[model samples]
Target: EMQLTPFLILLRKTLEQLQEKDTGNIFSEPVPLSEVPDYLDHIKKPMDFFTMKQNLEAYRYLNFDDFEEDFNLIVSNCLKYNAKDTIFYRAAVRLREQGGAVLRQARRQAEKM
Candidate 1:
């Protein structure tokens, strides 16, 4: 059974947009979406989606690749330290609507241990 999660909500939202939209990448993989909550519940702690949105926004300054890179840094930090602990710090990261705000934060925090 899948409980409601921030990532699940985000995925649903992202998926909804993708439903009648565009994605150049195929994103092929064997794993199905249904199994995601199981995967998440098994290995790691569930993340706060609302805060993640803020952090992703905080790192949105530059070529505008996407949140994957922005998120990976925090994910790594989660693996290194604790997800809860690191997420609190990341949430405190200043949010920038657009421009160098994201890029600067992304670069600076990428090296976070």
Candidate 2:
């Protein structure tokens, strides 16, 4: 088949073809079909990911407990500075790293109570 022969020849052609590069998030960007799967492997090699909601579970390695809402309040803020601009350039660092403003406020109120 053309598919099998093309791949057989493609792999033999170059060391560069065998290598994977950090092409960035495939989920939010357009990515070539061939590159999409490789790109997922690329991100996992250098980083980890997690989720949160209070209406947030903003804890990592920690499991979930819940309450809190108002996604109407959202921030599009980003760090203006960083050493590795290559990695941190587009958006902020991982969503988990940024402190959740509403969750923190809730904690403060609970402490005050």
Candidate 3:
């Protein structure tokens, strides 16, 4: 049997809640990939706590193939908008690492099942 770590469990639960909140109807809304600002706007918020939490949850539900691309897109867009924002870049890197960890845990759990 495999057990999720406390952090992984929390992340999984958070992601699930976010998905449920989408109510199916909103969950499948098409996000424009070409314009990063539009994508971010649709999600709402910027480099704040709420946005960070939302992004983490969003990443958890992302297909493995699209995860890296979406994450990188946000990072690149953040840098592009404010090249001098060291804090934003730092936060983005941290989010990427956290998302990777969550994905690894999810894969392990899926394999065990």
Candidate 4:
């Protein structure tokens, strides 16, 4: 009982941090299929901040690792779809660095006795 609550809070905090980034808007919504017709073909599993937020509320994540995978997917998908010279690619790179730090901090908090 206690275990689940803390993890949820940790996940929630991480989500908020990512959402606050300037590049956050790009990942806030699902990649519009109409805008990027090839997105589904490239990414087997599409992820976004909104989906993660919904999953957290629904208690879909059984552990921190599950949440971590989805978070990384958000960054990876962007990097895979956009060219290296594009803003989207650079934004994804920045988010990856920022999000990685947040994940490390969350892990330390979760491991605390």
| Candidate with the greatest lDDT versus the true structure | 4
Rank by lDDT, descending?
4, 3, 1, 2
Per-residue lDDT of 21 in model 3: 34
lDDT of 1 by residue, 7-113 (tens): 34443344233222212211112123384445444434333234445544554322224444433343343353335455433432311112134444443443331
Task: Report how far residue 39 has shifted in candidate 4, in Å.
Answer: 1.2
Per-residue lDDT of model 2, residues 1-113, tens digit only: 13334332332221121111212431122234374455444332222111112112322212111222211111121232223364543333443223244345444543443
Q: How far is 108's C-alpha from truth in model 3 (Å)?
A: 1.8
What digit string (tens of lDDT, one per residue) describes model 3 on residues 49-113? Answer: 23434555654523433433544454455555444657655554555555565556655545554
lDDT of 3 at 13: 60
Among all windows of 10 consecutive residues in model 3, the one with the lowest summed lDDT is 21-30
Against the unseen true structure, what C-alpha lDDT does each candidate score? 0.35, 0.27, 0.46, 0.86
All-Cα superposition RMSD per candidate: 15.4, 20.3, 10.1, 1.7
Report how far residue 22 has shifted in candidate 1, in Å: 25
All candidates in order of TM-score, best leading: 4, 3, 1, 2
- Pairs with backbone N, CA or C atoms under 3 Å apart (clashes), candidate 4: none
- 77-109: candidate 4 lDDT, tens digit per residue: 989989999999999999889888888887787
Candidate 1 C-alpha error for residue 73, in Å? 2.1
**What's the count of clashing pairs in each model shown?**
4, 7, 0, 0
The TM-score of candidate 3 is 0.37
Residue pairs with clashing backbones, model 1: 59-102, 60-102, 61-102, 61-103
